[PDB]
Amino acid sequence: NINDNLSINSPVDNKNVVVVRARKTDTVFKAFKVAPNIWVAPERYYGESLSIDEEYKVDGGIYDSNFLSQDSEKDKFLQAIITLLKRINSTNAGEKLLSLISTAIPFPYGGYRETNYLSSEDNKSFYASNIVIFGPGANIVENNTVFYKKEDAENGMGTMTEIWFQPFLTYKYDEFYIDPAIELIKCLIKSLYFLYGIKPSDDLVIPYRLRSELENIEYSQLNIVDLLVSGGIDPKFINTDPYWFTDNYFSNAKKVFEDHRNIYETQIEGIGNDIKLRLKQKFRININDIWELNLNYFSKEFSIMMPDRFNNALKHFYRKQYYKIDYPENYSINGFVNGQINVQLSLSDRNQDIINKPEEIINLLNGNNVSLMRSNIYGDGLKSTVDDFYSNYKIPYNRLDNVNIGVIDNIPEIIDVNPYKENCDKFSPVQKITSTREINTNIPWPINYLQAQNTNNEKFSLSSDFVEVVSSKDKSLVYSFLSNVMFYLDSIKDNSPIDTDKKYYLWLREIFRNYSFDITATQEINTDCGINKVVTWFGKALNILNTSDSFVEEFQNLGPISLINKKENLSMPIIEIYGIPNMLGLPLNDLNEKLFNIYLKNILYFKKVYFNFLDQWWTEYYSQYFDLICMAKQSILAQEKLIKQIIQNKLQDLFKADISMDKLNLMNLATEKTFIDLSNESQIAINNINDFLNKSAICVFDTNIYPKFISFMEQCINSVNSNVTAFIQKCTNITEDEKLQLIKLNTFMNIDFEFFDIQSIKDLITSETDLIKEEKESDYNLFLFTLQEDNNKVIEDISGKNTLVKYSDSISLVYGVNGDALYLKEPDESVSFSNKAFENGLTNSFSICFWLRNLGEDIITSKLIENKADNCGWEIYFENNGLVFSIVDCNGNEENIYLSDVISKNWYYISISIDRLRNQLLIFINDKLIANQSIEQILNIYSSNTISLVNENNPIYIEGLSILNRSITSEEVVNNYFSYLNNSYIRDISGERLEYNKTYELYNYVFPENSLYEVTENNNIYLSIKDTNNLNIQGAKFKLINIDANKQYVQKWDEGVVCLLGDEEKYVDISSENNRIQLVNSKDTAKRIIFNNDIFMPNCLTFAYNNKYLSLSLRDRNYNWMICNNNDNIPKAAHLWALK
């Protein structure tokens, strides 16, 4: 669909390249059409002067007259747009949106006249057009939408649209960079309002945020169109059910559409299918659908993350740093190269000239009235109103599936038009001045504390006192709250200077451990509201409740409300409950039908009032909590930026000392990998802040806003329930006795209007962006997935970090413990895993676990699994009977640990953990902890990015290989072990699946080394364990049989018989004289037995007959018989058996 291969210098053709004039202005501009009725003009917008006065420059803007003036950049402009537009077409959602845009034409004027046309300079042709994409205007970091004719955009006729765009710049929000493709869609959807002409009047506005920073009460506002289109969480507080916010626009909008529908049904006959047929597609969609379109829909389609809360006032919350984009070097048809978090962008050079205009200055005065510091607070730049909207709003009582891309594609393009007059409305740019207040205080604000943690000097020192930092002259102090880090740095002032890489490693490790303990500190509080995790350092970070010894103690006594500044802001709205029924006829008790419908409505009216309070909580109470979250994040990053400088300074000094060039190279590599660990640890703290304040905000509703809603509604019921009693006395036809019944049946108690769910509010707080984050984060660097298939193997990593796998052919798949295992049957076979995370370094912590089965049956050393390079790293290999785990340091420190249990043809579960915060190493075999060591002396381990799995001569099975980026505990190991074995199969003593029609030997769990053998006492034949002297005797041989031949493996709850090999077939039967088991020579009398096992004894088995287990008996002379037991004097263990 998308036109391409169009570039600057392409000759004018009057078909795809034209020159047209801008409205009635005496200027022209080249144009290119990328799709039917869609155009792109690679120019700066004609309607503004690129140069403006210093007074009129808005906050946070960039101004540059030379941008997009040279043909060099002008050509790149066309390619960037085409890359994004084709990117949108990649998904069906984009096709519907773009297709609907192409087919949407303004209603022709009443012979008929058309508005959709761009006039050629010389008045000799006209080109159909709906959208025009220009370059940025005066401000090159803001996108707009401009309507061709104002009235037509509101009267339902519709009009042409113009869009501005900035494709070459972006900024990062939290972890990710913002995708420009989503920005283009936001401006495209807003165009549909203009073509359908459903633009609301400029007075249709809603409150958006309480400007709590100001001393006087003031509210910001947002247009209804912006709130609907922008998407996020806010619209969920307006678009409730039933609707609680109404205006004439909604009712008026629906009516006008029907009128043009009807007139069209007479217009269907006539000038050309290019128009008559085109209007049919426009009328297929209903206006209600357009009101439903929003960005949240598209983020799901493209899996694009974006800001979600107050995403139209971000200018107030934090400052934006810009980055550059290059097409197609960084951005292609599949979005950002390497994804939205790992894309490697370069800071823009235009960050140095952002216009700053504070909304207010906070001047901090000392005891002598001298300004210690002045901080700046910036406004969101939205419209402000001082009137209380909620107090003056009266809650009323009385009040893209069918796009069919196929049909639109077949519509012939417009060849000729009948131009209409006065399509061009004169454009005048809106220019506004920014005002500024000022304030004086003696108590620092949170913004004052935050500004004290920044600095410009490369040399400084952390201080825990706020007074010294601000009052210092040299500016060699910066405020900090890392108690442990400051304590450590202060305890080594007198030591000799660092001059050895070994001493550098020890210093670097202590800084990292202390920083992680300080930043991730939390405490647990039990509240009426749930369980809460309180961030301990919150008090000192921003000076909230910081006036006492402990922050957590104060928090419990005063509660969540104490954090915010403006405590009481609620206002009762205007209520209009005329509950009195409005008397004709109704002579019977069938009056109940009328009364019941009135009862139902009164419930809804109670709900809409409830939604009004939630919106007030969101706009007036949540807003102030979200502000604390942003400031707390700014604080964490500021402290992180200071630790990097301290580390950088130490390393730069050490580079001047007398250390080998090669050792310096490794120290540089180890430090670089540590910076990644600091960033990860900071990200944990940010997550702790979020949930801590989200639960506080939700909770203030339960204890503060909700009780007020009860009291206000308590009176509004006494006023309406009595009004229903009065009515039913007036009614005469019904009997008196029924009056008492109906009064009791239509009376509201407190229960009827009581709505609150702690869960149902948490669903509102969670956006789609939060779902993407939790659906894409894990602790696995490697998760091997194996799958046999017809003439095909599938071996790959599904961990989401896309490790690379390389394996030699002839690697076969075979069933192992719970799925498919690699079978390295033949010598010199190998498998490789490649990932950057496998280079460990000094600070990383990780874990590895897998299942193992060895068919070597030889006492010879052999390599198994290795990540060593030049005798630095770790490995596992065979020695003697068991395994050995080795880990070697750059300096030559080692740990060689020997594990003794391992022998041939058994299944083992091996799990290894490395913990650097505690300096602890843990090794598990199956269920039990084998080793618990301190690796305090190991320091730096740096090796390849490749892990190699190999054979020498031993055939082996491997299954479930996996690697974690964190240490594990005993509880996790035990759960994993038993959960994996909890499947439907019975197993042998060695861990393999049991089989029908295969020979075995039988052992009892109580006597694990004696096998059963046949004994003849009378003509009958019995079984018992061998005595202590005749142990040399050979055990009997058994087999399992199922009636259904061709069945191979035994599963739980299967029935069968037991057969003994010999010269004559024998089968097991239960004696009657005594409950001993005896052998018979007839398959007819053989007993049917049920097979089963125990969850916590995976490789053992049990036989059951009519719900009685088979077990051993107490000693009888020399024999312990195999019997059908019912006594309680025999141990429960005696009824567990093992095979082979």
Coordinates of C-alpha atoms in Angstrom, one line a residue, residues 459-460 462 484-516 642-654 667 670-672 674-675 678 842-843 891 919 936 939-940:
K459 CA 36.7 16.1 44.2
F460 CA 34.3 16.2 47.1
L462 CA 29.9 13.0 51.5
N484 CA 27.3 2.4 55.9
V485 CA 29.3 3.8 52.9
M486 CA 30.2 6.9 54.8
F487 CA 31.1 4.8 57.8
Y488 CA 33.5 2.6 55.7
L489 CA 35.2 5.5 54.0
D490 CA 35.8 7.1 57.4
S491 CA 37.4 3.9 58.9
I492 CA 40.3 3.7 56.4
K493 CA 41.7 7.3 56.4
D494 CA 44.9 6.4 58.2
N495 CA 45.8 3.3 56.0
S496 CA 48.6 3.3 53.5
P497 CA 47.7 4.2 49.9
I498 CA 46.4 1.5 47.5
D499 CA 49.3 0.3 45.3
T500 CA 48.5 -3.3 44.4
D501 CA 45.6 -4.8 42.3
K502 CA 44.8 -7.2 45.2
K503 CA 44.3 -4.2 47.6
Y504 CA 42.2 -2.5 44.9
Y505 CA 39.9 -5.5 44.7
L506 CA 39.4 -5.5 48.4
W507 CA 38.5 -1.8 48.5
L508 CA 36.1 -2.1 45.5
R509 CA 34.3 -5.1 47.1
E510 CA 33.6 -3.2 50.4
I511 CA 32.2 -0.2 48.6
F512 CA 29.7 -2.4 46.6
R513 CA 28.5 -4.5 49.6
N514 CA 28.0 -1.4 51.8
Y515 CA 26.1 0.5 49.0
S516 CA 23.7 -2.5 48.5
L642 CA 28.2 9.9 43.4
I643 CA 29.5 6.4 44.0
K644 CA 30.6 6.1 40.3
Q645 CA 32.8 9.3 40.8
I646 CA 34.4 7.9 43.9
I647 CA 35.3 4.7 42.1
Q648 CA 36.4 6.5 39.0
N649 CA 38.8 8.8 41.0
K650 CA 40.5 5.9 42.8
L651 CA 41.1 4.0 39.5
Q652 CA 42.5 7.1 37.7
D653 CA 45.0 7.6 40.6
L654 CA 46.0 3.9 40.5
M667 CA 41.2 -4.1 36.7
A670 CA 36.4 -5.8 36.5
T671 CA 35.4 -2.2 37.4
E672 CA 33.3 -1.8 34.2
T674 CA 30.8 -3.7 38.6
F675 CA 29.0 -0.5 37.3
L678 CA 25.3 -1.1 40.9
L842 CA 34.4 -9.6 41.1
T843 CA 30.8 -8.8 42.2
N891 CA 45.8 -14.1 41.8
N919 CA 30.7 -14.6 50.5
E936 CA 35.9 -14.6 51.1
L939 CA 38.4 -11.9 44.6
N940 CA 38.3 -11.6 40.8

